[PDB]
Amino acid sequence: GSHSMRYFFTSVSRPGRGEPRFIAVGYVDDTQFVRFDSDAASQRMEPRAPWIEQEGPEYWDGETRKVKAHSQTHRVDLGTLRGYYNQSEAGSHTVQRMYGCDVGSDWRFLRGYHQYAYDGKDYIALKEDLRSWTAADMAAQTTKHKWEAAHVAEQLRAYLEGTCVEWLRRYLENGKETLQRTDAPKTHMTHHAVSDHEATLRCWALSFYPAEITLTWQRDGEDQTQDTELVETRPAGDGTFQKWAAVVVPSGQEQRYTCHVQHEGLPKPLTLRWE
């Protein structure tokens, strides 16, 4: 299938005392593989997947140097943004940054992204051309002109189409036993009577990877959305994901209802009926 590498950075200012909390995480697809937390003891980029542990001291030194530098850039940015928005020094504010690259089934570059937010709202983002900028407001427009003058997009484009994809491919090979393995959802249906007259059927998908999945209900072969509930896909905690969809039905009429499960790990979609 297709693959991605993404890095996520969060900095939160601490007006009362000290410097911002800074947390960075890296993912390949839906697998976290590195982290940095300013509150942690190591003050280093740390491994979070077995397949990255083999990287040598040069790797860990460089990653640490770069991520610590990111944290300082965000610290300064928090100050700059406070000024741009004429805000008090008294409140906590947040900067977030996310970037990454997608490759296709042939592992060739598909798309790149790099976006930045202040207090949870879009601030500035690299457009899909990897040349242009979307600035959400006039502060961001100031930043955009600064970033033009500093050749920021050129550097990001080079990283996104080069280093990003090259190292993604490296990771995919080194962690192939898990990263290139799909875990099909284990599926079953439960039944929960609400009265003599009706019952909830709940269609479960468990222990699947990657997280992308579609669960749908049909009645007599046509999509049903009335009287249904679909929960957000959630992490099991062991690297896999879970989801369920439920429908309320007249008791005795269960066989009219089918749950349909689509997932990359399934050659053909599954159909479940109450047994």
């Binding site: 980029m45 770069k66 990111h70 940015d77 930043t143 990001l156 280093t163």
Partner: peptide, 9 residues
């Protein structure tokens, strides 16, 4: 591999 930090905002 992480990118080098960008210019400040």
């Amino acid at each position: 591999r992480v990118a080098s930090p960008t210019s400040g905002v």
